[PDB]
């Protein structure tokens, strides 16, 4: 009955055998024909459309429920076949094992808790990042960390799972396995134990406080960077929960010291990767605005990615109107930076200062008090702005200002260069129409 179902590879007959579950249950585990049946169920595991089926999730979960002893051969089979399937197939398998945990109960579920998940995360701690399967392991573990909020009590069983194995993973001397431990830890926070009292609540949150303090006081730069991004996610998610003394101490620690870490530039770029998603914090805007002018020198870095991310927060701040950017940073320092900038950075600066440079709603008087300014006080930044403006905006906006100007005089070279840039603008806007 099942044999022709696997030979035809049809899900309808497998759903029929799902409906007769007790008839499948009557076959003994000791049977070798049941072992061949189990191999054909592994052939069902190979099938991708069965994985897409939610009834597929149902019968695979009850195959896990059927035989406790078969689960270790299932563990060996999925150990053998992680390499073949893709990322969406990995998160599909993760959904299967989430529902497999959910349907399971009793001593079989306790054996699954002592069997499957802890070995997978132990491997994902100890697998090299060179292995592509390692990526699959921590992405399905991140899916589990995302699903722990959906169902209540998941946090407690992962706490009782991670009571042995999180703590020595925190102090793992090897940088890679501690980096993976930090990667799981920063999404693991907060960890809750339901039966414990308020003393133990305050003690465990203070334990997490000193744990993240030591993890951000790591000597390795990449472990520091992962800790930075993690406490950025923590301060974004639950800033209302922490005491304000702890919050002020941690922000002073990550601002007064961390911005000037001359050992590595990309750790400061990781701080830069952090800074937009803390700016959603509405109450702490004066508190962060106290430390906003501390970063004026960071314009003068020699790292490209640092400055690219830096202007990305400048655009983010001008989007959210958190603070006056001209009060934050001098304009002339920005202008000599443009004189020393690169192409995509100058594109982002043109998008940044386009409100300051060219107004579209304001009349020709405002257009000319900015035109005379941008002609006279700097010149090369004006020609870069000419180069990027028609890329950014429509050529009608170019032509209207050209006709305004048509309706520095001491230099013949200046008027010749202005004629040349007018010809350049004409050549740029001719191709549009």
């Amino acid at each position: 009955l099942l044999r022709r179902s696997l030979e035809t590879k049809t899900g309808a007959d497998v759903c029929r055998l799902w409906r007769i579950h007790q008839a499948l249950y009557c076959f003994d585990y000791d049977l070798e024909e049941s072992g061949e049946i189990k191999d054909m169920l592994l052939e069902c595991f190979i099938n991708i459309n069965y994985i897409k089926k939610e009834e597929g999730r149902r019968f695979l979960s009850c195959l896990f429920n059927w035989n406790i002893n078969f689960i270790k051969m299932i563990h060996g089979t999925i150990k053998n076949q992680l390499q073949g399937l893709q990322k969406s197939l990995m998160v599909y398998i993760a959904e299967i094992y989430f529902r497999a945990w959910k349907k399971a109960s009793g001593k079989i579920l306790e054996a699954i808790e002592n069997d499957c998940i802890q070995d997978f995360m132990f491997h994902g701690i100890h697998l090299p990042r060179r292995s592509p399967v390692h990526s699959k392991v921590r992405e399905v573990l991140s899916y589990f960390h995302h699903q722990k909020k959906v169902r209540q009590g998941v946090e407690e069983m992962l706490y009782r799972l991670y009571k042995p194995i999180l703590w020595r993973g925190l102090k793992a001397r090897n940088s890679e396995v501690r980096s993976n431990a930090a990667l799981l830890f920063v999404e693991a926070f907060p960890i809750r134990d339901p039966n414990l009292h308020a003393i133990e609540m305050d003690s465990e949150i203070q334990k997490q406080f000193e744990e993240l303090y030591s993890l951000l006081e790591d000597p390795y730069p990449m472990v520091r960077s992962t800790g930075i991004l993690g406490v950025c996610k923590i301060t974004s998610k639950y800033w209302e929960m922490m005491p304000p003394t702890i919050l002020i101490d941690l922000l002073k620690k990550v601002t007064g010291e961390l911005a000037f870490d001359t050992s590595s530039a990309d750790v400061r770029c990781s701080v830069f990767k952090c800074l937009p998603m803390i700016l959603d914090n509405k109450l702490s805007h004066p508190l962060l605005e106290q430390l906003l002018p501390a970063l004026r020198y960071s314009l003068h870095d020699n790292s490209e990615k640092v400055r690219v991310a830096f202007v990305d927060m400048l655009l983010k701040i001008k989007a959210v109107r958190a603070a006056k950017f001209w009060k934050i940073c001098p304009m002339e320092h920005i202008l000599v930076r443009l004189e020393t900038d690169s192409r995509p950075v100058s594109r982002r600066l043109v998008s940044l200062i386009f409100n300051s440079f060219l107004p579209v709603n304001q009349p020709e008087e405002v257009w000319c008090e900015r035109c005379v300014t941008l002609v006279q006080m700097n010149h090369a930044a004006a020609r870069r702005f000419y180069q990027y403006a028609h890329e950014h905006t429509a050529c009608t906006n170019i032509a209207k200002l050209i006709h305004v100007i048509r309706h520095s005089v001491n230099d013949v070279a200046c008027m010749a260069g202005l004629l040349e840039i007018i010809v350049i603008l004409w050549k740029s806007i001719d191709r549009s129409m």
Binding site: F325, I353, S356, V366
Partner: peptide
Amino acid sequence: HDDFF
């Protein structure tokens, strides 16, 4: 927060 002028 947009235009300096």
